[PDB]
Write a protein that binds this ligand. Structure first.
Ligand SMILES: Cc1cc(N2CCCS2(=O)=O)c2oc(-c3ccc(O)c(O)c3)c(O)c(=O)c2c1
Length: 272
């Protein structure tokens, strides 16, 4: 609506375009996403670790979603600190907060479906928030195997897999499974975690796109996956990456993992 004055074009959203804008009325700086019963619900999905949806505006087939604005995203923060790496305390805080945000959405039956560094926003207060939450109901690097294998009614576990991939990237400073096509993505997972079978994943051989012809890769020792992360960390990650969605640790249980024992809330140094 006319009540806004775009300040600059942030980025291309997986649904449309996102602008930094200012409300003439409230005088508040916001994020204007250019694109119903599904978004409305999302307005009541409030939590400190979930980017707030301020308003929804529908007009002439044009849909606008107004969100609180944050200055930087996790992807941009990882590139600018890839030579020095993000300190463990911060990685642990971020992971602990993300799991909090997730534990809340899930407790309410809302999946993100497409978590990735770009949609994780941070501020100078050391807080990180989930962006584009619930909007699903091009990167494939954070997509869970069951999704890739054709499961149509996948669960909250898919978000856990994505966060697990992200957690691994912060530690090593390189994408875990950098797929450039669905088959390449699926095979990259297989080559690290081992081709799944009925032993570790009951039901895998009956899934829509599974094939008795998939190559049989061995599971690589986990200590070569994300070094030099400590045991509490490798233990948590392995559970976030279990093949079977029913076995994959939930957000709630992960917050109880010993890894968060010494969890604090440091602040990164932003250079807005
Ligand atoms: C520096 C930067 C980059 C991005 N973006 C990261 C990738 C999408 S974006 O370019 O908007 C971004 O997205 C969203 C956002 C929230 C919810 C949603 O549904 C969106 O579509 C976008 C914000 O509130 C925000 O403050 C912000 C800031």
């Amino acid at each position: 609506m006319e009540n806004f004055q775009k300040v600059e074009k942030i980025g291309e959203g997986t649904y449309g375009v996102v602008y930094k804008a200012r409300n003439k009325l409230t005088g508040e700086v916001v994020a204007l996403k250019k694109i119903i019963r599904e978004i409305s619900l999302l307005k009541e999905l409030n939590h400190p670790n979930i980017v707030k949806l301020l308003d929804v505006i529908h007009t002439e087939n044009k849909l606008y979603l107004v969100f609180e604005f944050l200055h930087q995203d996790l992807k941009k923060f990882m590139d600018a600190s890839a030579l020095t790496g993000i300190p463990l305390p911060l990685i642990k805080s971020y992971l602990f907060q993300l799991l909090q945000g997730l534990a809340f959405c899930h407790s309410h039956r809302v999946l993100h479906r497409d978590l990735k560094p770009q949609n994780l926003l941070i501020n100078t207060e050391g807080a990180i928030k989930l962006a584009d939450f619930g909007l699903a109901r091009v990167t494939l690097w954070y997509r869970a195997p069951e999704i890739l294998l054709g499961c149509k009614y996948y669960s909250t576990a898919v978000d856990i897999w994505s966060l697990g991939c992200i957690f691994a990237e912060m530690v090593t400073r390189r994408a875990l499974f950098p797929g450039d096509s669905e088959i390449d993505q699926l095979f990259r997972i297989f080559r690290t975690l081992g081709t799944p079978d009925e032993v570790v994943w009951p039901g895998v051989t009956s899934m829509p796109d599974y094939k008795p012809s998939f190559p049989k890769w061995a599971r690589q020792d986990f200590s070569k996956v994300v070094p030099p992360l400590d045991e509490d960390g490798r233990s948590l990650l392995s559970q976030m990456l279990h093949y079977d969605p029913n076995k994959r640790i939930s957000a709630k249980a992960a917050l109880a993992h010993p890894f968060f024992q010494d969890v604090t809330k440091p602040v990164p140094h932003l250079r807005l």
